[PDB]
Structures are given as C-alpha cells and as structure tokens.
Design a protein around this ligand. Structure first.
Ligand SMILES: NC(=O)c1ccc[n+]([C@@H]2O[C@H](COP(=O)([O-])OP(=O)(O)OC[C@H]3O[C@@H](n4cnc5c(N)ncnc54)[C@H](O)[C@@H]3O)[C@@H](O)[C@H]2O)c1
Ligand SMILES: NC(=O)c1ccc[n+]([C@@H]2O[C@H](COP(=O)([O-])OP(=O)(O)OC[C@H]3O[C@@H](n4cnc5c(N)ncnc54)[C@H](O)[C@@H]3O)[C@@H](O)[C@H]2O)c1
Ligand SMILES: [Mg+2]
Ligand SMILES: [Mg+2]
Ligand SMILES: [Mg+2]
Ligand SMILES: [Mg+2]
Ligand SMILES: [Mg+2]
Ligand SMILES: [Mg+2]
Ligand SMILES: [Mg+2]
Ligand SMILES: [Mg+2]
Ligand SMILES: [Mg+2]
Ligand SMILES: [Mg+2]
Ligand SMILES: [Mg+2]
Ligand SMILES: [Mg+2]
Ligand SMILES: [Mg+2]
Ligand SMILES: [Mg+2]
Ligand SMILES: [Mg+2]
Ligand SMILES: [Mg+2]
Ligand SMILES: [Mg+2]
Ligand SMILES: [Mg+2]
Ligand SMILES: [Mg+2]
Lengths: 90, 96, 92, 97, 92
RNA sequence: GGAGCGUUACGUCCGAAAGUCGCAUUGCACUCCGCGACACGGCUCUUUAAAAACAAAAGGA
RNA sequence: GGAGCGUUACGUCCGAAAGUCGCAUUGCACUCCGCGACACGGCUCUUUAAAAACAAAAGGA
C-alpha cells in the first residue's frame, strides 16, 4: 500500500506544533525532498503527523528505516497513509 | 474598676482580640501608635494572665497622653481598644 | 547564525542565580572576555542563560567546545543567540 | 617496576586560580565534578598552605578515578587544573589545620 | 555458659592496651587467679576484653560482682565467653 | 507489642517545638510557663539504648 | 474602570494573554475547535509606563 505520504503516530503529544514539524523535517529530510509536514493538536489528531514526500521512493525508505526510531522519548510508529494527500492528488 | 489616670510614659491597653499572634499584634500596635511619639518598646504576652493586653512605652509622657486620648475606643481587630496608663513605670523608664 | 552571544539551555533549574552565573564564568572565561552572563529563574529564563563575549570568535569556540558539557549533572545545549530584541524580551 | 599511584576516593587539585573566593570556588568545583558521582565534601581554605588547592571527597573510589582522568588539565577560571589522588587522611588533615 | 573466661565490652577505646589490661587486672584479681587478659585495639577487639580465670568460680563471681561497674566513665558489660574458638578468632 | 533512630516537602529549622480547633479567661507586665485535643513511611534492636542508613501520598514554622 | 508595580508565608525563588498545570485521548488527516484549573491585600499613575514603597486571612515550588 505505498504512498507519497507516511502516517506517523505514537508521537509525544506534549511537543509544540512547529517544533515538532522542524524536528521531523530534520530527521526525515535525508530520505528525499519533503513536500510538507501536517501536524494538528486537536483531540482527534494529536500524536500524529503526515509527512508528504515528493517521491514514493523516499517515503518507503523513510518508513522502514525510521520504524520505531526513538523520538522525544517515544518510538515512532510509521505506516503509509491510507489515501493520497491533497497536494499529491491535485 | 477605676482606670489608671496617673500620666505615665507607658500606656496599658486591653480588650484586645486575643486571636492575633504576638508579632502581628506588636507590629500593628506600632503602626497605629508611631505617629504620637518615639516608641521605646511594645510588650505583648499571650499567657493566661497577660493575653488581651499590651504595654506601649513612649519616650515622652506627652506622647502617651495624646496616644491615650486619641485612640481610646479605636476599633482594632473588631474590638474597641480600652486604654489606661500603666500603674507603674516600665523598667526601661525606671532605669533612665 | 554566528554572533557575540551564546544561548545555553538544559541547565539545572535548581541552582541559585548568583551561583549559576559564577559557575558559568568559571568554565566559559577561557574562551574570551565575558561581557555579561544573563540568568533568571523566571518562567521564561529558568534553565537557560546567555553568555556575551567581546568577540564573535570566542562565542563560536565556546559553542563547539562546550557543547554537551556536563554541568551540575546535566549536558548543556548551546546555540547562537537570537537578536538583542529577543534577549531583552525573554529577560523581562 | 614503576608503581601505579594508589587510588583514593579523594582527589587533590592544584594550579587553581588563587583570585577566586573560597566559597565560590567550592560551588564552582561542585558544578563540574558532581557528574562523576556522589561528593561528600569539598575542602578549601584561605590558609596559606591551601592556596590554589582543593580536595574533592567522593563516596566511591571509582568516581575519583573517572574524575581525575577526565578532568586532568581542564581549564578552570583560565587555568588548567592539575589533579592527583590524595595520599592519606592524615595528609589532608595536616594541609587543612 | 559457665566459662573460666569472661567477655567484657563497652570499654573506652582510647585507653592503650597495657593500661587497659593492668586496670582490668586490678579490679578482677580479687576474685581468683587470673591466667591471662586478652585486649586488642583492632576492629574486632577495640572496646572489649577477655579475662581468663584459673577457675570458673572466680569468673562467676566477677561476673555479677563487677557487672555494670563504671570504668573510665563507662559501665562495663560482662559476659561469659561463648567458645574457645570465638576467643581465638577475635584475637586474630 | 515495646524501645531506639527526627533522615526526608522548594529545602532549611522543628516534630518534648510549633500551628490549629475546643473550652476557660477582661487579666498591670517587663524571663518565660491555663487546660484538653489533633500526623508520619521505613530501618534497627528486644525492657536495652545502642548502631547506620532512610520517605512528602505523613504534622508544624 | 484601565495600566504599571512580583514586595511579602519558615524565608528564598516563582507568580498566564501565541503561556502553564491536571485529567482524558493511540486517534488517517489536509477550513479553528476534548474537559478542567490558573489565587492575591495594597501602592502609583490616568491610555502613560514610569517611579519607590508594601501584605500570608491570596497561588506555586
Ligand atoms: N526515621 C527516623 O529517624 C524517625 C525518628 C523518629 C520518629 N520517626 C517517625 O515518627 C513516628 C513516631 O515516632 P516514635 O517511633 O519515636 O514514636 P513516639 O514519638 O510515640 O515515641 C516516643 C517515646 O517517647 C515517649 N514520649 C511520648 N510523648 C512524649 C513527650 N511529650 N515528652 C517526652 N517523651 C514522650 C513515648 O512513651 C515513647 O516511648 C515513627 O513512626 C516514625 O514514622 C522517624
Ligand atoms: N505588590 C506588587 O508589586 C505586585 C505586583 C504585581 C502583582 N501584584 C499582585 O497580583 C495581583 C494581580 O496582579 P495584576 O493586577 O498586575 O494582574 P494582571 O495585570 O496580571 O491581571 C490580573 C489577572 O488577570 C488574569 N489573566 C492573566 N492572563 C489572562 C488571560 N490570557 N486570560 C484571562 N485572564 C488572564 C490573571 O489570573 C491575573 O491574576 C494584584 O492585585 C496584586 O495582588 C502585586
Ligand atoms: Mg485590620
Ligand atoms: Mg505500630
Ligand atoms: Mg513509637
Ligand atoms: Mg522523639
Ligand atoms: Mg527536593
Ligand atoms: Mg507540645
Ligand atoms: Mg500532637
Ligand atoms: Mg514506627
Ligand atoms: Mg520507604
Ligand atoms: Mg498534629
Ligand atoms: Mg514560626
Ligand atoms: Mg478608580
Ligand atoms: Mg517575585
Ligand atoms: Mg527555615
Ligand atoms: Mg517572616
Ligand atoms: Mg479561534
Ligand atoms: Mg483549554
Ligand atoms: Mg501559580
Ligand atoms: Mg519544584
């Protein structure tokens, strides 16, 4: 089920929005160009982040290489997104 | 009882709310009496015999008189102060 | 963005301001003349400090040498400071 | 044939900046040495025999060894510390009288 | 428990051995011939002593007679010696 | 059961102190003293007071 | 009313506005959005932001 966009959860919910975005960007940029990182602190979406890679190539490599990577004292759980993100489908 | 009416360097106060703690009491007495003269000492004990009462020692008898007459019946912690002269000199005053 | 001043954080927040300043001078003086050390225990400054050097050269060496240096049992994190405006703000 | 220096849970520090007040010196020493383990005392004096010198008394000997080895020559108030194991408890007392 | 040797403790540890031994001999000879007195200021024996009587009856008397006696400002605690192996072990 | 150990709250001083609640008290001191009541994990020893450690989810200031 | 002032509990530090704490939440989105809590005597000035004094019957470590 690969996809340009990986779904990360089990993230530390105490981290401020833009710090979290920066810290994810630094730790996932190696894998390729990141189009965007979507983070929301609502009840429904805290602890979660969508990283949008330019290439599925980068996303797949990011998923297994960083699966369980320790991040703000919690191992991050990474799957592919179940749909396409807006930017990837426009 | 007949209040002590001999002018004296020290005024004897009673009918004081004895729920107040020593240091608060002394400190609040010094605030409301400092404008009458130099105060040499304020004596407060919470023992059985001495609670509800305070001694305020002025350097000059005139200060005590004006203090007594101005502050008589003053509401102090919801009780009106009763102020007399001390029946005897305080020791710092007898020394002198 | 290198400049005269380093921003240190992950400092042990249970140390008194006067002692924390003298202890920081003790280890950072080797790098250059310290113009000032800014510490406060306010909610905005607690666990953080600014050290201001006469020369930018000193701040840069201080940053790289003392990165992670354990200090009051905590490895300190060092960055270049932002603008004087940002400093004045976090100190009020 | 050359013998290892005998470990001690107390380290002897010298080449210290003599311009620092003793009280501050103690607290600054604590700040850089507490990382190696529990400190029981730091010994400094204004007396003339203790000039530019200090003892840091650790609970465990392993602490003193790690502290000596890691901080040997560490620049402290613009002066590299010289660190060695303390010799004996009598010697510490004589130096502190 | 009746032994010809008694074990004393709560002795002041700053008295030097010979002195402690002769002082002990004076206050105990009156009960019977003392064959020997064992003192040492090692970790195992500082503050304590064994007194070796020729006869058990000498040691039973000294037990109760001299119990709690004040000695260099401290009350003596006297007991029978448990075993000859304990005595020899304490003195090694 | 009993006793010793007062180490610990930010981190100090206390815990035979202190604060609080309830009575009682209108009282002339210079030194201070009316009752009564109201917390504490754990360690050690066993009518003995020694030893060496130790908690803020347990009391005061 | 407004603004500035953070001095005070044993006696030290702290004392919101885009921040903090507590509880709940493992949730697949691309138009904000769970619930609860954040005390405080007084002083000074009058849209200025300065000045120099100050409380534990008022919050936190
Ligand atoms: N860890 C420690 O070092 C330590 C030390 C003391 C107390 N504590 C804690 O305190 C609790 C109670 O202390 P305790 O175990 O000593 O019990 P406790 O204080 O009741 O015992 C004290 C002893 O002194 C006597 N006593 C009682 N009141 C007295 C008074 N006003 N004046 C003189 N003597 C009096 C009692 O008869 C008792 O034998 C313990 O359970 C423990 O939690 C801990
Ligand atoms: N003596 C002094 O030097 C001094 C100085 C400052 C404060 N104080 C004390 O503090 C009290 C309050 O200080 P102030 O008058 O400067 O208060 P303030 O100007 O901080 O505002 C008062 C109240 O507004 C509330 N508040 C803050 N941010 C908020 C937000 N985003 N949304 C809703 N409410 C918010 C806070 O609860 C605060 O207590 C004073 O009455 C005084 O008792 C004393
Ligand atoms: Mg009032
Ligand atoms: Mg019990
Ligand atoms: Mg008990
Ligand atoms: Mg006790
Ligand atoms: Mg603490
Ligand atoms: Mg009592
Ligand atoms: Mg009680
Ligand atoms: Mg107990
Ligand atoms: Mg425990
Ligand atoms: Mg109580
Ligand atoms: Mg108090
Ligand atoms: Mg008005
Ligand atoms: Mg403040
Ligand atoms: Mg204190
Ligand atoms: Mg006070
Ligand atoms: Mg809104
Ligand atoms: Mg909210
Ligand atoms: Mg608060
Ligand atoms: Mg805290």
């Amino acid at each position: 089920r690969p996809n340009h966009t990986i779904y990360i959860n089990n993230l530390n919910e105490k981290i401020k929005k833009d710090e979290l975005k920066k810290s994810l960007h630094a730790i996932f940029s190696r894998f390729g160009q990141i189009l965007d990182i979507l983070v929301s602190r609502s009840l429904k979406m805290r602890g979660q982040a969508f990283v949008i890679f330019k290439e599925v190539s980068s996303a797949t490599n990011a998923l297994r290489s960083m699966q369980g990577f320790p991040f703000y004292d919690k191992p991050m759980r990474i799957q592919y997104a179940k749909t396409d993100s807006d930017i990837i489908a426009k």
